[PDB]
């Protein structure tokens, strides 16, 4: 909520991705904290397994509800940190409700 | 420009992709958002930091706000705690 | 300090170009035999694989830690 992005670049979301989709490289932000300089999910490579949702310790990467993101060009499907963070901000209200409903189960 | 500062110079090729298009960058840049977060004052020497909400937070860690000299910062939230 | 990954011999092909990709900055490689590392139990068998497949080989002898004598009593010696 405060506004600090949840990901702390542990990079095991990259480790467990079956398709090699997520590419993460990180460096200590000036704050001294640990953040990802580049987080790129290749959605065409991704097979939407949902393990990344599973693996994240801070649960920074989540499987969002929207399924309608068909794109005219192949490049648009490749997603960098800014698109995903923007995707996160747009759907945060529903993502929070969805995680709220299913966390007891997990 | 962006959180990291990725930017293309004038001589830089690979900047054409934006020609007649838009780039993805972020307002609400996080780098400054926790800096905007007040320092959580505490009574105890050590304090926890579930991230807020337990299971819906970060793996709990206990921070040593033992020196006023430094406000402990949970490595996960970047929240400074003022002894 | 675990030594379970220093047991079996491995033969690894020489490393090749890894240029940056212009669109996303991902590493890109043109060498197919790069990520391939075959594991062979003994030096003799690995040498055989190189000869019949025709790849050049340069075997490196295993170097195992030398026996080191240790005894808790020895360091308690004020003398030395």
């Amino acid at each position: 909520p405060s506004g600090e992005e949840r990901c702390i670049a542990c990079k095991l979301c990259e480790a467990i991705c079956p398709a090699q989709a997520i590419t993460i490289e990180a460096e200590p932000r000036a704050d001294g904290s640990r953040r990802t300089t580049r987080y790129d999910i290749d959605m065409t490579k991704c097979i939407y397994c949902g393990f990344c949702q599973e693996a994240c310790p801070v649960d920074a990467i989540v499987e969002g509800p929207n399924f309608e993101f068909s794109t005219e060009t192949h490049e648009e499907l490749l997603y960098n940190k800014e698109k995903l963070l923007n995707n996160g901000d747009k759907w945060e209200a529903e993502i929070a409700a969805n995680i709220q409903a299913d966390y007891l189960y997990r | 420009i962006t959180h990291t500062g990725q930017v293309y110079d004038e001589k830089d090729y690979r900047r054409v992709r934006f020609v007649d298009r838009q780039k993805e960058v972020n307002e609400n840049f996080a780098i400054d958002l926790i800096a905007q977060q007040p320092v959580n004052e505490v009574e105890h020497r050590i304090i926890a930091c579930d991230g807020g909400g337990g299971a819906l937070g970060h793996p709990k860690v206990y921070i040593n706000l033992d020196k006023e000299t430094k406000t402990g910062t949970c490595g996960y939230c970047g929240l400074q705690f003022k002894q | 300090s675990g030594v379970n990954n220093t047991k079996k011999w491995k033969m690894e092909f020489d490393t090749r170009e890894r240029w940056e990709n212009p669109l996303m900055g991902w590493a890109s490689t043109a060498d197919p035999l790069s990520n391939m590392v075959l594991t062979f139990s003994a030096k003799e068998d690995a040498i055989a694989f190189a000869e019949k497949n025709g790849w050049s080989y340069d075997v490196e002898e295993k170097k195992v830690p030398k026996p080191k004598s240790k005894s808790y009593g020895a360091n308690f010696s004020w003398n030395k």
Binding site: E75 | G5, R17 | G25
Partner: peptide, 24 residues
């Protein structure tokens, strides 16, 4: 309840000795 462009966000990785602009 009541067009993106993908790019590498990481910066350069190997810098380059810039010629001395002082002629010799």
């Amino acid at each position: 309840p009541t067009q993106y462009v993908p790019y590498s966000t990481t910066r350069k990785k190997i810098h380059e000795w810039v010629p001395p602009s002082t002629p010799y």
